[PDB]
């Protein structure tokens, strides 16, 4: 929603969004499943996974905006160096691949 508020050329669909926006994502899931919604805009790691679990929904189009997966914490946490090192170690020792298979 902050990204679309940063968007300018998307203004033709702002009222169509605001007329039917949901406070929950599972409400939108059941809305697409019961055709109360026809297009839910969300990241691939959720949409394509639940499309791979439940055989009623399918993703359309490519990755319309490149997005990451960040963490949040307070300022002055100087152990975040070793935290990012352990991130690279999970990336290095294939523990991310263990989570990937699992």
């Amino acid at each position: 929603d902050i990204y679309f508020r940063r968007q300018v050329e998307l203004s033709t669909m702002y009222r169509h969004m605001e007329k039917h926006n949901y406070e929950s994502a599972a409400e939108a899931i059941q809305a697409v499943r019961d055709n109360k919604l026809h297009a839910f805009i969300w990241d691939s790691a959720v949409l394509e996974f639940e499309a791979s679990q439940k055989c009623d929904l399918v993703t359309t189009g490519e990755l319309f905006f490149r997005s990451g997966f960040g963490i949040g914490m307070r300022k002055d946490s100087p152990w975040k160096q070793q935290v990012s090192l352990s991130i690279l170690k999970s990336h290095e020792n294939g523990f991310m691949e263990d989570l990937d298979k699992t």
Binding site: E62, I71, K80
Partner: peptide, 29 residues
């Protein structure tokens, strides 16, 4: 009210201008 926030977070400029955070690890679209 939090020492750590663990969530799927696409950190924007307004998030990052107030907080500290370690590096993201997963990338999506």
């Amino acid at each position: 009210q939090a020492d750590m926030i663990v969530a799927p977070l696409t950190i924007n400029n307004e998030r990052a201008q107030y907080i500290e955070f370690s590096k993201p690890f997963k990338y999506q679209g």
